[PDB]
Scaffold this active site. Structure first.
Site, short mmCIF file in Angstrom:
data_model
loop_
_atom_site.label_atom_id
_atom_site.label_comp_id
_atom_site.label_asym_id
_atom_site.label_seq_id
_atom_site.Cartn_x
_atom_site.Cartn_y
_atom_site.Cartn_z
N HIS A 4 39.52 37.12 36.75
CA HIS A 4 39.51 36.94 38.19
C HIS A 4 39.04 35.54 38.60
CE1 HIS A 4 39.41 41.55 38.82
NE2 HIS A 4 40.61 41.08 39.05
N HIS B 91 49.46 40.05 40.50
CA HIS B 91 48.07 40.00 40.08
C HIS B 91 47.87 40.71 38.73
CE1 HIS B 91 43.61 40.31 40.96
NE2 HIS B 91 43.76 41.37 40.19
N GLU B 92 48.42 41.91 38.58
CA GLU B 92 48.21 42.67 37.36
C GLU B 92 48.87 41.99 36.16
OE1 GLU B 92 46.18 45.10 36.89
OE2 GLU B 92 45.67 45.14 39.02
N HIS C 17 46.69 39.60 34.61
CA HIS C 17 45.83 40.21 33.61
C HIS C 17 46.59 40.47 32.31
CE1 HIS C 17 42.45 40.64 36.33
NE2 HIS C 17 42.97 41.62 37.04
C1 LIG Z 1 39.75 45.21 37.05
C2 LIG Z 1 40.43 46.47 37.58
C3 LIG Z 1 39.38 47.58 37.57
C4 LIG Z 1 41.05 46.20 38.96
N1 LIG Z 1 41.80 47.41 39.41
S1 LIG Z 1 41.77 47.71 41.00
O1 LIG Z 1 42.51 48.93 41.22
O2 LIG Z 1 40.43 47.83 41.51
C5 LIG Z 1 42.50 46.46 41.73
C6 LIG Z 1 41.86 45.72 42.73
C7 LIG Z 1 42.48 44.63 43.34
C8 LIG Z 1 43.77 44.23 42.97
C9 LIG Z 1 44.42 43.04 43.61
C10 LIG Z 1 45.80 42.96 43.81
C11 LIG Z 1 46.37 41.82 44.39
C12 LIG Z 1 45.55 40.75 44.77
C13 LIG Z 1 46.13 39.52 45.41
S2 LIG Z 1 46.48 39.83 47.12
C14 LIG Z 1 47.12 38.38 47.75
N2 LIG Z 1 47.11 37.26 46.97
C15 LIG Z 1 47.61 36.10 47.44
C16 LIG Z 1 48.19 36.05 48.77
C17 LIG Z 1 48.19 37.28 49.58
O3 LIG Z 1 48.67 37.31 50.73
N3 LIG Z 1 47.64 38.37 49.00
C18 LIG Z 1 48.71 34.68 49.09
C19 LIG Z 1 48.50 33.91 47.77
C20 LIG Z 1 47.71 34.76 46.77
C21 LIG Z 1 44.18 40.82 44.57
C22 LIG Z 1 43.62 41.95 43.98
C23 LIG Z 1 44.42 44.96 41.97
C24 LIG Z 1 43.79 46.06 41.37
C25 LIG Z 1 41.94 44.98 38.85
O4 LIG Z 1 43.05 45.10 38.30
O5 LIG Z 1 41.53 43.88 39.29
ZN LIG Z 2 42.31 42.13 38.92
#
Ligand SMILES: CC(C)[C@H](NS(=O)(=O)c1ccc(-c2ccc(CSc3nc4c(c(=O)[nH]3)CCC4)cc2)cc1)C(=O)O
Ligand SMILES: [Zn+2]
Ligand SMILES: [Ca+2]
Ligand SMILES: [Ca+2]
Ligand SMILES: [Ca+2]
Ligand SMILES: [Zn+2]
Length: 160
Positions: A126, A116-117, A120
């Site tokens: 998002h 995910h990161e 970015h």
């Molecule tokens: C904008 C900043 C402020 C924020 N930082 S955070 O600390 O609040 C943060 C919050 C959430 C996340 C995160 C990590 C993994 C995911 C996919 S989880 C997932 N995805 C998939 C599957 C799964 O099982 N899990 C199957 C296919 C796709 C979704 C959100 C990362 C960081 C950010 O980086 O977004």
């Molecule tokens: Zn994010």
């Protein structure tokens, strides 16, 4: 504005600057390599690991104030952030070591959060699709890149 943005080059380097206590070196290295491959498998992007010096995407684990204007907050709350494409901190990814990182369903799965990161880091914002990797809320559902994310990264870099 300003949601997405792309690197002017597609040969990108990364460096793992330090390692969490939570996992073995090998587990961390596997997680990040798999996370980059998510994106390189569906685009012309290619990622090379450097063991020293400056890389495009600098990866590090830290707590509280760790060198930028975006401090972490102890256990809970924030877990990680990554800067949009560009020089210096651009592309870099930071992980809050006051969270617990795993290769399992416990804590936060490092592969999933890193994938995910790095989205970015490559210029993605998002998704509103709860099944997408780039959805704002972390879940662990048990890997194939969802089509919403494939479309998003290919709209920036084209297909593989
Ligand atoms: C904008 C900043 C402020 C924020 N930082 S955070 O600390 O609040 C943060 C919050 C959430 C996340 C995160 C990590 C993994 C995911 C996919 S989880 C997932 N995805 C998939 C599957 C799964 O099982 N899990 C199957 C296919 C796709 C979704 C959100 C990362 C960081 C950010 O980086 O977004
Ligand atoms: Zn994010
Ligand atoms: Ca935190
Ligand atoms: Ca950088
Ligand atoms: Ca930790
Ligand atoms: Zn940071």
């Amino acid at each position: 504005f300003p949601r997405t943005l792309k690197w002017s080059k597609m040969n990108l380097t990364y460096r793992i600057v330090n390692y969490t206590p939570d996992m073995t070196h090998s587990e961390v290295e596997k997680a990040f390599k798999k996370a980059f491959k998510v994106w390189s498998d569906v685009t012309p992007l290619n990622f090379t690991r450097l063991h020293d010096g400056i890389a495009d995407i600098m990866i590090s684990f830290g707590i509280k104030e760790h060198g930028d204007f975006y401090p972490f907050d102890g256990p809970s709350g924030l877990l990680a952030h990554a800067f949009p494409p560009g020089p210096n901190y651009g592309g870099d990814a930071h992980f809050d070591d006051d969270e617990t990182w795993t290769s399992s369903s416990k804590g936060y799965n490092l592969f999933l959060v890193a994938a995910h990161e790095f989205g970015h880091s490559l210029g993605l914002d998002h998704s509103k699709d709860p099944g997408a990797l780039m959805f704002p809320i972390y879940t662990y559902t048990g890997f194939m890149l969802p089509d919403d994310d494939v479309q998003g990264i290919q709209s920036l870099y084209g297909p593989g």
